[PDB]
Amino acid sequence: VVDPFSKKDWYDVKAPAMFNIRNIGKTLVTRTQGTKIASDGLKGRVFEVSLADLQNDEVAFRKFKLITEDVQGKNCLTNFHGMDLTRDKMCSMVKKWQTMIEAHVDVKTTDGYLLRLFCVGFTKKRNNQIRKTSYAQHQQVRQIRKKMMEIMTREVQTNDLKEVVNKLIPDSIGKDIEKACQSIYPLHDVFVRKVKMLKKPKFELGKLMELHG
Amino acid sequence: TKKRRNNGRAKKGRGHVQPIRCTNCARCVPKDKAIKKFVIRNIVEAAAVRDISEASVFDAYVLPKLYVKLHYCVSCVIHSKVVRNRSREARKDRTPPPR
Amino acid sequence: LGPQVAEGENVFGVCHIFASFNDTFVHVTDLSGKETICRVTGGMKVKADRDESSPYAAMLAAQDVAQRCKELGITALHIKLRATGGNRTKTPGPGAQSALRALARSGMKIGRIEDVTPIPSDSTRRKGGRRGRRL
Amino acid sequence: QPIKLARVTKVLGRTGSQGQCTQVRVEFMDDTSRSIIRNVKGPVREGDVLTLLESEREARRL
Amino acid sequence: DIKLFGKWSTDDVQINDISLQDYIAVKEKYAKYLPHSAGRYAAKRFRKAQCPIVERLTNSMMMHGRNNGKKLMTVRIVKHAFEIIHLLTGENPLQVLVNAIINSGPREDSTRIGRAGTVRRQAVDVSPLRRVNQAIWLLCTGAREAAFRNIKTIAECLADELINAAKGSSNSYAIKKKDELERVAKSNR
RNA sequence: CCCAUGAACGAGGAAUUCCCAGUAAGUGCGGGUCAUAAGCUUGCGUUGAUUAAGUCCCUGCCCUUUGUACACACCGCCCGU
């Protein structure tokens, strides 16, 4: 009857200034017709893009959720919306003869963003270990989890979203936790496993403009 | 007559073990008794590895793997030939197959 | 009509391959996932219940999907392969590999490959009884 | 669909309910020689030359 | 004076390559003036493959139960009116003589899958001899049925048989039947 | 044996038997029986061979392990108003 792609415009998706790569791809929407407008149709769609496609010298197992906030000049302007690890990476770090320690905090930044950071760490076998299994005791696991939560809170609640994502890009918080927990039980693969945004402040166009450079 | 000293399961010093579901039939089988296979397989089969590699946008992509933990009841594990019946003497051998 | 910008570069879509043991889905969509380009299943390529999940039906579906995406301007694809998941099986069906190979073989560029089958932190009861299905 | 000359290295065996296909492994001579396996039909003698009109047909084994 | 037949020769037919003698191989005692050399092609496998394709072509008309095997028939067929066509052509029939059949040939046949299911066939191939001569066997049936209850008869198809014999290009019929089956079963790659 | 008086006049319900090279099949001949009595059998040549150099799917057999409440041995044994 009517070809629906003949009435569709293509749009450019832009990453925030925290990433070396700016244009992360293209996206579609039906043209503004009657009640429905194109800009509203592109205002909540989330792009999960591998970090290696965002930064040219980074790891590919880290994915960032970028959500478009507003569209001007047929460019879609995105913001940090979440971070995750690839399923294969997480499944690869879960081995059978070690303890996995997980922690999570709900911590707000200085610009009103409320985040839920998930940290995962694994017990490391020493280079001369003859014992098959390396297990942390329950109090050791509790201390490691407390250190994880404390470090995440210290690393999030004092900076705004920009510096939080800048720390996430090389996972500074995970390396800090791995360093801090070395004297309780040597940890193996410490990562901020997942970041999900619980609530955001009211939209500010100028803040988003300063965000995209 | 007692066929196995461990009664075909790996439960010592505890009363109850939580059940799981066989991946084939969905039978309720205790976790200690169930036969567990950890399959780490490439998402791209070896026949298709070269064709996917050439069509890759990124050079040196190293394709991801699949991590699936398989739980089996005794009936389905025997039928699938994951385990076989053994002699009265070879039954005691707990060493995994050298492969 | 399509993106005719920077002909020397790639236009990336996302192919959601749903390979259950009944049939296989070859669903290419926008980068965000909200807009869909074309979805061709193995059931609209074979007129029989059994071959719905066959590798040949998946190859046909992937060929048609790639043809439509090429005629629609999309040049490269990110792969998000899933099995049935949930409390049911986590192994992709027989058509997943053939669909992916048919996408690669028919002039499409493959991006990142990711497995996204729904995995419960723990689930509801499976459809079988406590004695399983006995056929 | 290039034409490549490859030599049979080993004969595996037959397959089917009653046995109707033959398995051999052929190695290339002028394509950065590597070992590829392929099923085959008919008299393909001990270490003969099997011609590959294509480098992608494999043998699904068992 | 080692010239093959009374007309041909082995001193001017050269390809400067020793990898492509799988169709015509005249370099040793196997060279035949007239194909009536007797012999048994069913004594062992890889022996009907060791056949000269001329002999296999002419003999493989040994079908029905009443015309089966009789070498006098094939030698009379390939002698009669071949003796005529040699002095009646003068020019070279080599063009069509090679260029319809001996690369009409297909490139893949198929095999059975798993343990059951007669709805599709996994595409395979062979080193060219078996597939080309399976096309040749179906062409034996096809040329027969082009004679069998038909107008152009046996002992007079010498042109088409030289086509079915010699070397390298594509015009055949049962071979394009085999090529239809080729594509159909080749959709499984 | 001859007059040529014209019989679905050119790959066959369900079920299947035998067979891998001088197999099969066609074809005649000789022995036995006998009165040179053969449509039978036992041999012999003659013409002459499409397909297959494989498998354990059907029917079975064997060199193992395993289960059994069977040992008249699965055509077993055995439960139920």
Swiss-Prot record, chain A:
The keyword Methyltransferase does not apply. Its main location: cytoplasm. There is a cross-link at K14 (Glycyl lysine isopeptide (Lys-Gly) (interchain with G-Cter in SUMO2)). One of its GO terms (molecular function) is RNA binding. The modification N6-acetyllysine is found at K14, K36. GO terms for cellular component: cytoplasm; cytosol; cytosolic ribosome; cytosolic small ribosomal subunit; endoplasmic reticulum; extracellular exosome; focal adhesion; nucleolus. It is found in: Cytoplasm; Nucleus; Nucleus, Nucleolus. GO terms for biological process: cell differentiation; cytoplasmic translation; negative regulation of apoptotic process; ribosomal small subunit biogenesis; translation; translational initiation. The modification ADP-ribosyltyrosine is found at Y135. ADP-ribosylated at Tyr-135 by PARP1 in presence of HPF1. Keywords: Acetylation, ADP-ribosylation, Cytoplasm, Differentiation, Isopeptide bond, Nucleus, Phosphoprotein, Ribonucleoprotein, Ribosomal protein, Ubl conjugation. Disulfide bonds: none annotated. Belongs to the eukaryotic ribosomal protein eS1 family. Component of the small ribosomal subunit. Mature ribosomes consist of a small (40S) and a large (60S) subunit. The 40S subunit contains about 33 different proteins and 1 molecule of RNA (18S). The 60S subunit contains about 49 different proteins and 3 molecules of RNA (28S, 5.8S and 5S). Identified in a IGF2BP1-dependent mRNP granule complex containing untranslated mRNAs. Binds with high affinity to IPO4. Interacts with DDIT3. Part of the small subunit (SSU) processome, composed of more than 70 proteins and the RNA chaperone small nucleolar RNA (snoRNA) U3. This is Small ribosomal subunit protein eS1.
From Swiss-Prot, chain B:
Component of the small ribosomal subunit. The ribosome is a large ribonucleoprotein complex responsible for the synthesis of proteins in the cell. GO terms for biological process: cytoplasmic translation; negative regulation of RNA splicing; translation. Keywords: Cytoplasm, Diamond-Blackfan anemia, Disease variant, Endoplasmic reticulum, Phosphoprotein, Ribonucleoprotein, Ribosomal protein. One of its GO terms (cellular component) is membrane. The modification Phosphoserine is found at S53. It is found in: Cytoplasm, Cytosol; Cytoplasm; Rough endoplasmic reticulum. The keyword Ribonucleoprotein applies. It is linked to Diamond-Blackfan anemia 10: A form of Diamond-Blackfan anemia, a congenital non-regenerative hypoplastic anemia that usually presents early in infancy. Diamond-Blackfan anemia is characterized by a moderate to severe macrocytic anemia, erythroblastopenia, and an increased risk of malignancy. 30 to 40% of Diamond-Blackfan anemia patients present with short stature and congenital anomalies, the most frequent being craniofacial (Pierre-Robin syndrome and cleft palate), thumb and urogenital anomalies. Residues 86-96 have a biased composition (Basic and acidic residues). This is Small ribosomal subunit protein eS26. The gene is RPS26. The lineage of its organism: Eukaryota, Metazoa, Chordata, Craniata, Vertebrata.
From Swiss-Prot, chain C:
Its main location: cytoplasm. There is a cross-link at K45, K47, K90 (Glycyl lysine isopeptide (Lys-Gly) (interchain with G-Cter in SUMO2)). It is found in: Cytoplasm; Nucleus, Nucleolus. The modification Phosphoserine is found at S123. It holds the Pfam family Ribosomal_S11. Residues 115-135 are annotated as: Disordered. GO terms for biological process: cytoplasmic translation; erythrocyte differentiation; maturation of SSU-rRNA; negative regulation of transcription by RNA polymerase II; ribosomal small subunit assembly; ribosomal small subunit biogenesis; translation. It comes from the Eukaryota. GO terms for molecular function: mRNA 5'-UTR binding; RNA binding; structural constituent of ribosome; translation regulator activity. Keywords: Cytoplasm, Isopeptide bond, Nucleus, Phosphoprotein, Ribonucleoprotein, Ribosomal protein, Ubl conjugation. Residues 126-135 have a biased composition (Basic residues). The modification Phosphothreonine is found at T117. One of its GO terms (cellular component) is focal adhesion. InterPro entries: Ribosomal_uS11, Ribosomal_uS11_CS, Ribosomal_uS11_sf. NCBIfam families: PRK09607.1. Component of the small ribosomal subunit. Part of the small subunit (SSU) processome, composed of more than 70 proteins and the RNA chaperone small nucleolar RNA (snoRNA) U3. Belongs to the universal ribosomal protein uS11 family. This is Small ribosomal subunit protein uS11. The gene is RPS14.
From Swiss-Prot, chain E:
It is found in: Cytoplasm; Nucleus, Nucleolus. The keyword Nucleus applies. GO terms for cellular component: cytoplasm; cytosol; cytosolic ribosome; cytosolic small ribosomal subunit; extracellular exosome; focal adhesion; membrane; nucleolus. The modification Phosphoserine is found at S127. Keywords: Acetylation, Cytoplasm, Isopeptide bond, Nucleus, Phosphoprotein, Ribonucleoprotein, Ribosomal protein, Ubl conjugation. One of its GO terms (molecular function) is RNA binding. Component of the small ribosomal subunit. The ribosome is a large ribonucleoprotein complex responsible for the synthesis of proteins in the cell. Part of the small subunit (SSU) processome, first precursor of the small eukaryotic ribosomal subunit. During the assembly of the SSU processome in the nucleolus, many ribosome biogenesis factors, an RNA chaperone and ribosomal proteins associate with the nascent pre-rRNA and work in concert to generate RNA folding, modifications, rearrangements and cleavage as well as targeted degradation of pre-ribosomal RNA by the RNA exosome. This is Small ribosomal subunit protein uS7. The lineage of its organism: Eukaryota, Metazoa, Chordata, Craniata, Vertebrata.
